[PDB]
């Protein structure tokens, strides 16, 4: 996260770190959506141009964390993957359309002050909140700058951007399964996701029922926090029918 701030303790208790076993490293962010299901970006797991293709056994999910590198004894919980499910039409060839994946945990994780699931939106909350200028929140342990690394979880709030402006910012073909967020150069303020934040959540707090909903997934961008560029997010509500199908089938 570039131009964000330290998170408060327990501020994002659905935050998940995807951790490579060997070598031991931060692979990506992710989200807890129940006691056995974790949501992330397909590209975190599968990206053939770069020979990326992780198997369950290659990684761990770490939940309840605040510090990036420390083993947070008595606070974090580490869980093994039973199975990965990637969207069958994830378009890694062209534009990362449908950049979404699910991971089922081998055992249920115990909820705690630091570990708690985020909600997924239904049509009405997406319609109500996914509006240009409405702000969401992105969190992660990614890089602090495009070209160091944070000691603890970072947080930044960013406004959703009008679809024409998203489109006009990039030569990539944008789809209805993506939205973009970030300030425009003339708005003064800054902030973006960056390398290591991939797969983590874009959340919004409903003013109707005071609950946090994950509206997006950190998916892609061009550099980080560049003027005239915006972060792109997977549109979670638009792929919810696939999420439901998977969870209901498995």
């Amino acid at each position: 996260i570039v131009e964000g701030s330290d998170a408060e303790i327990g501020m994002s208790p659905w935050q998940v770190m995807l951790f490579r076993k060997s070598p031991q490293e931060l692979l990506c962010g992710a989200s807890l959506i129940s006691d056995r299901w974790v949501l992330t970006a397909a590209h975190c797991l599968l990206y053939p141009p770069w020979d990326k293709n992780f198997t369950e056994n290659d990684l761990l999910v770490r939940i309840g964390k605040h510090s990036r590198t420390r083993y947070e004894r008595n606070i974090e919980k580490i869980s093994m993957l039973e199975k990965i499910y990637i969207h069958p039409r994830y378009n890694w060839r062209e534009n990362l359309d449908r950049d979404i994946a699910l991971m089922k945990l081998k055992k249920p994780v115990a909820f705690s002050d630091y570990i708690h699931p985020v909600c997924l939106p239904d049509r009405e909350t997406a319609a109500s909140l996914l509006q240009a200028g409405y702000k969401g929140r992105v969190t992660g342990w990614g890089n602090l700058k495009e070209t160091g690394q944070p000691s603890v979880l970072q947080v930044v709030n960013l406004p959703i951007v009008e679809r024409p402006v998203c489109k006009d910012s990039t030569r990539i073909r944008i789809t209805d399964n993506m939205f973009c967020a970030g300030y425009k150069p003339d708005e003064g303020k800054r902030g973006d996701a960056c390398e290591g934040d991939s797969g983590g959540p874009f959340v919004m707090k409903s003013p109707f029922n005071n609950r946090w909903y994950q509206m997006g997934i950190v998916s892609w961008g061009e550099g980080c926090d560049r003027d005239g560029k915006y972060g792109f997010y997977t549109h979670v509500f638009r792929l919810k029918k696939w999420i439901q199908k998977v969870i209901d089938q498995f």
């Binding site: 701030s5 408060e8 303790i9 327990g10 501020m11 208790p13 959506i33 705690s112 002050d113 630091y114 708690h116 699931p117 985020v118 909600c119 997924l120 909140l129 200028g133 409405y134 702000k135 969401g136 929140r137 947080v155 709030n157 406004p159 919004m204 707090k205 409903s206 003013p207 005071n210 609950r211 946090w212 909903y213």
Partner: peptide, 27 residues
């Protein structure tokens, strides 16, 4: 049932330091 209500914030009626920025944007 309990999704999206944080033990150290909503459950205890405590606000985090920037959640009001989001609220102000929801016009």
């Amino acid at each position: 049932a309990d999704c999206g209500l944080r033990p150290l914030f909503e459950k205890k009626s405590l606000e985090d330091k920037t959640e009001r920025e989001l609220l102000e944007s929801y016009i």
